[PDB]
Amino acid sequence: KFPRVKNWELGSITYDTLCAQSQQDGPCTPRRCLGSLVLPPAEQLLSQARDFINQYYSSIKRSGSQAHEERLQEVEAEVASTGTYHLRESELVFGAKQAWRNAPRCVGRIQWGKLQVFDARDCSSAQEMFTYICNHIKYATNRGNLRSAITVFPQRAPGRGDFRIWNSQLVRYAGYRQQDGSVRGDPANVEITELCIQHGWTPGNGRFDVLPLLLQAPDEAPELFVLPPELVLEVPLEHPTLEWFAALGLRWYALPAVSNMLLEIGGLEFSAAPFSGWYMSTEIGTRNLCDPHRYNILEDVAVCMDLDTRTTSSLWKDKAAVEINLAVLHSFQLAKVTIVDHHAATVSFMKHLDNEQKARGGCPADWAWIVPPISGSLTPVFHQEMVNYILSPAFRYQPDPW
Amino acid sequence: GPKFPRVKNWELGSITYDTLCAQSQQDGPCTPRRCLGSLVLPPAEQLLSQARDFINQYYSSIKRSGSQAHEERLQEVEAEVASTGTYHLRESELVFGAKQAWRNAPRCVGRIQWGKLQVFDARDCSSAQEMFTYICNHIKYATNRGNLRSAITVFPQRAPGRGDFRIWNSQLVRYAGYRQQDGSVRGDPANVEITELCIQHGWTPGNGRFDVLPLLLQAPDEAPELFVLPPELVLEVPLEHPTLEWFAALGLRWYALPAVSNMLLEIGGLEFSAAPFSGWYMSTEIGTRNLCDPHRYNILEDVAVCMDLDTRTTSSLWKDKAAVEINLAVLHSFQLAKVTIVDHHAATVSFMKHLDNEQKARGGCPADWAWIVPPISGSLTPVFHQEMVNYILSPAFRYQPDPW
Ligand code: HEM
Ligand code: HEM
Ligand SMILES: Cc1cc(N)nc(COCC[C@@H](CN)OCc2cc(C)cc(N)n2)c1
Ligand SMILES: Cc1cc(N)nc(COCC[C@@H](CN)OCc2cc(C)cc(N)n2)c1
Ligand SMILES: C[C@H](O)[C@H](O)[C@H]1CNc2nc(N)[nH]c(=O)c2N1
């Protein structure tokens, strides 16, 4: 039975029929819903391959053409003989865009057709990965006029170990574990900071020390590469009216570039395929700076604003958070670096849901991730029912390589 | 290791397994192919087995499982079903089942309080006039001049052939919503339909933004009858802001008592179609949802203008600023009027404690994440970082179709 999807603000109703194209299972069953959880042979590869080839030629209107049939035989021949096959560059470009389009947790999908795709499948060493990573950052950063991009390194092969980027993002601040349990810097990065030191990085001692990359070619120890500081664009944070805010010395980097997820296209797996767009302000201002287990700066800001910390019912937390998000937006605007606030972002996601309804008969969307972390019911997406499911091409989680 | 849902808190880094979900009899809306968790809406021996399961729950809660009193009660229940098709609850079974239904409710953040519930047994009620009396008593007891007390009143269960006891209104206290000529609504847009039914049944409509609705009460096989709550039984809080002096001039108010009246209480397969329950409010229910939903009072823009914010650009965060002050005003006004209320921070902290109590007591706690996380400041509350397993346990509060 096809899910009846309701918007509770407008009273309007759609049916998701795209979900019937899901061949991959989620965490839920009839007995118990698990959607808020954050983490989880040839014939089988061959059917994923054909389905993806089908998707591709259909995308270009050439379904059933000579080109389509010869391509299917090519894939069939390659798999039967070698247990694997390879994508053409245009197929890869199509699959990368489709993976983003299909990503249930991403609120920036209105953008999905505008993705710069660097083919790095001819990469043979960590040194080469590094040069590719640098060009990606250079291109994507674009002096603050951010552009969405993905770089795709060589696929997994039954023989050997994977190409991997050990870092979870290409740009990450160090977290230094003190002996007295506390952390200087970003607590989310304690373990990666520690790995870098193991592999011979000289650590700094600041709150915003940019980490080096740990790049690993197949069956080789990962190698260390410091990013050239001029490649990493950063925004000093200040507030439009509160002068003391700048004194906090807060900053954030411009480029959100995820570097630990696997890209699956047609049953092929790309263990290193870092990707990037631009930030939504709440990622920085709410989660990264205010999570109790991150920089956790809410009390500092509240004390500065002279708020009554002694009681929850003064909404000191809520007031501080708002000012922090505002500073992020202000400082990024002042520095001419691309950013989108959570109101503009969710408004455009609504438009996206509507495009997808017309094009595909639905849109996989994970409500808990799409609704922003402050002012939820203030945005239109809170009021919109959403159906979550896995379509392929997909970005998947994979184990940490250590 | 364990073959039950693994549940993680991402703030604390701690793990638990939910083993309670193994007691779920009723299927929910999700399947392996697709998650419908964000959707707001989903006898014979069938009765017997639900009855048996409930009686077992009862005897466990008083630690007499396998006892002679337990096996006798089971027999008494099948005997009764055997000859009538239905059965009836002892008084303390009803009290236990009502508390358990609250405790089982996945959408309620107030559940730390579940043990403390006044159960008014009203299973002798035989007319609509008498429901009105019981309801008035409930409001008087629960309101307690502002020192609010959780309560439920239980009217006679559904019976074969015979028609239902129903309260037509969705809540005991609801403000009218009048459809205007210019297509807009005066009052609360959520209440247009029930407002128009009150008028069709001979209510003389007011024309304010905060006109308290009458009750449409229906006794078995009878047309609903209309009853006006005496104004002094309905405590309201006028809204003002601690520092923004003009806020009082907005003339906004809200009622003290949240009392849900259109849900069905199901216990051991028995169906209580009229069983209103009340607690106290969490501030975001009023200040964020009721006052700021675009499809509700929708006052955000009015407040932002008074605060002199830049409403022409999303990036000023004008909505965020206004919503915060509206919530502060709700809290402050309730505090001043000495009417019980809880902020979204205190509420979620207490829910975390509830979750920990339930882990030890029952091995899990069914929880609907989207509903438990408040509608402002989500990640600022600890529940945002808590994974949750949602599933249906019984006794349960259930939705039921509108009587009309
Ligand atoms: C263009 C601007 C973009 C914006 C504003 C944006 C926004 C976001 C946001 C806010 C999240 C939530 C994740 C979190 O809370 O940490 C997210 C997740 C995600 N986005 Fe985007 N996105 C953008 C571009 C992209 C691109 C280019 C890709 C891939 C090509 C992508 C794929 C994803 C994926 C896979 C996730 C889920 C990550 C996870 O589960 O850990 N997005 N996006
Ligand atoms: C003691 C104070 C209480 C507080 C602060 C509280 C809080 C809440 C909140 C915030 C919601 C969601 C409201 C919404 O979004 O509309 C809710 C839902 C609910 N609560 Fe409570 N609650 C309380 C007492 C009770 C009591 C006494 C019962 C029943 C005996 C109850 C049963 C429910 C149920 C069944 C729902 C779900 C309603 C639905 O699905 O539409 N709660 N609670
Ligand atoms: C492309 C893009 C743009 C944008 N504005 N934001 C993003 C999202 O940032 C990604 C953060 C992701 C990491 N894969 O989600 C957080 C996370 C994921 C996992 C698996 C574990 C963990 N602790 N935290 C991605
Ligand atoms: C007892 C109680 C205390 C408290 N603080 N808050 C409440 C919540 O009020 C419940 C409102 C419920 C109605 N069943 O949610 C609104 C709603 C639900 C549904 C299914 C549809 C709809 N249009 N509107 C209940
Ligand atoms: C447990 C819960 O699902 C978890 O905290 C999720 C909720 N929603 C989220 N939404 C976004 N965008 N990012 C997140 O990290 C999370 N965390």
Ligand SMILES: C[C@H](O)[C@H](O)[C@H]1CNc2nc(N)[nH]c(=O)c2N1
């Ligand atoms: C689509 C979505 O389920 C809907 O807007 C829900 C979201 N979360 C909610 N949470 C609560 N507490 N109350 C609600 O009415 C809603 N509405």
Ligand SMILES: [Zn+2]
């Ligand atoms: Zn689910």
